[PDB]
């Protein structure tokens, strides 16, 4: 029977319009962890203008295992955008668990198109803030 440890994190990115126009910016959250004394530290990373030219039209969003004393940790993950009413928008999940090691990330290079994100009719940048939710499911055995 797989053993699963779930934990979540809410990241508010303030001053979203002050993300750089030039390519290459990476913004990262504070670290977070489960309530367990597992010595795992995680964060989220966004490229507001993508990782490369193929993804230049998108925000890229990944889950990074920042610190880990074990050789690997397998985890499923899900990311969502909260809109101005607090509602779940444009969430996507990994479906399978991915193998993390310290310094390794997994996520979506084309998480959301900037044109959709910056369209005020979608209500995703209220008061110039982007709110991202992440649920992580660590699978042990």
């Amino acid at each position: 029977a797989p053993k699963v440890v779930k934990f979540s994190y809410m990241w508010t990115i303030n001053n979203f319009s002050f993300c750089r126009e030039e390519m290459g910016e990476v913004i990262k959250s504070s670290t977070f962890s489960s309530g367990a004394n597992d010595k795992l530290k995680w964060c989220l990373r966004v490229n507001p203008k993508g990782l490369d030219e193929e993804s230049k039209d998108y925000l890229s969003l990944y889950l990074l295992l920042v610190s880990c004393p074990k050789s690997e940790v397998r985890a499923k993950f899900k990311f969502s955008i909260l809109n101005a009413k607090g509602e779940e928008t444009k969430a996507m999940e990994s479906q399978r668990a991915y193998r993390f090691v310290q310094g390794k990330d997994w996520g979506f290079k084309k998480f959301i198109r900037r044109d959709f994100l910056l369209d005020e009719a979608n209500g995703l940048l209220p008061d110039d803030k982007l709110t991202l939710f992440c649920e992580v499911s660590v699978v042990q055995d």
């Binding site: 996507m92 193998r99 310094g103 997994w106 979506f108 290079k109």
Partner: peptide, 15 residues
């Protein structure tokens, strides 16, 4: 193009 692409990748190759 597609508003979101639900395909997983990493920023690094290997582990």
């Amino acid at each position: 193009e597609a508003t979101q692409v639900p395909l997983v990748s990493s920023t690094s190759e290997g582990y």
